[PDB]
Every structure is written in structure tokens, then in C-alpha cells.
Amino acid sequence: LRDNIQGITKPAIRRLARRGGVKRISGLIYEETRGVLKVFLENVIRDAVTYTEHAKRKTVTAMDVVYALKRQGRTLYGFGG
């Protein structure tokens, strides 16, 4: 895959920011926030793939990512488990 973190386009970061309650966003927040999101994805999808490899599956499934989240103190309600 090419460079797909650039697909978290600047306006989308502003939407997330706007939800969070902030008025004014310096231009260096965009390239910092992509950095934070890529580090979070790495540390959850690694666990989700290790739960997958244990079961001899190829397809990653919703319970794998939910168990991956559950161990990091970041439990998600909505997809079971």
C-alpha cells in the first residue's frame, strides 16, 4: 500500500477537533495527529492479528479486535464480548 495515512484529510481532523470542543487549531496539529492515530492503529491491530494467528484463521474478525481493545483498558460496547 502506498501512503494511505494522507487519506485522513485535513477537514476530517478538524471535524474530530470540533467535536472535542476546540476553537482554533494551529497548522502543525494536522501532521501531529496523523502521527498519534498511526501509533494507535499499530498497537491495536498487532494484538488483533495475534488473536487471529492463534485460531489459525486468515480473516480478522470483530471479536478479535474487540478482545484486542479489551486488554488495553479501551473496552468497546457494540460488537459483542
Binding site: 473496552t75 460496547y77 457494540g78 460488537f79 459483542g80 464480548g81
Partner: protein, 92 residues
């Protein structure tokens, strides 16, 4: 094969408290997750409590303690006062 869920007891309890009201399916999955998260936390803490005291069983007191640790505040003294209704009725 059957899949099993708590989905009917949460609905049954909803009609206990809001007789006109209902739940959307996506908002059922929340209760069906929440209710089994609190199951696991009680089971896990009650299990450790038996182990620390080198018991094998898990009687009522091995759970009433696990609730009185795990719940934050008024919910502890309410849930303890609620569960001691249930077993007191059952043992008659």
C-alpha cells in the same frame, strides 16, 4: 446451532420500569455487552477472593465481598441490600 444471549431479560426488565418504552436493536447490543462485562468482573474477583483465603467453593459471601469491592458508592450498599433480598426469599 443456538447462540444464546441475555436479550430477553433486559427487555423483560425494561417493561418493569417503563411500560410504554422500547429499545432499538443497535441499542440492545449495548445492554447485551454491558450485562456480561459486569458478570465477568464479579466472577473474576470472587475467584481471586476464594484463592487468597485458600477456599475451594464460592458461597454467597465470596460474591457479596466481590460486589462490595467492585461497585463505586451508593450502588454498593444498594446492590448488597438487593441481593440479600433474593437469597433470603430463595431459602424459604
Amino acid at each position: 446451532s443456538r447462540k444464546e444471549s441475555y436479550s430477553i431479560y433486559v427487555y423483560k426488565v425494561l417493561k418493569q420500569v417503563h411500560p410504554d418504552t422500547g429499545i432499538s436493536s443497535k441499542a440492545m447490543g449495548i445492554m447485551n455487552s454491558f450485562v456480561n462485562d459486569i458478570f465477568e468482573r464479579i466472577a473474576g474477583e470472587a475467584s481471586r477472593l476464594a484463592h487468597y483465603n485458600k477456599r475451594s467453593t464460592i458461597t454467597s459471601r465470596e460474591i457479596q465481598t466481590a460486589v462490595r469491592l467492585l461497585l463505586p458508592g451508593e450502588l454498593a450498599k444498594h446492590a448488597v441490600s438487593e441481593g440479600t433480598k433474593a437469597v433470603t426469599k430463595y431459602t424459604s
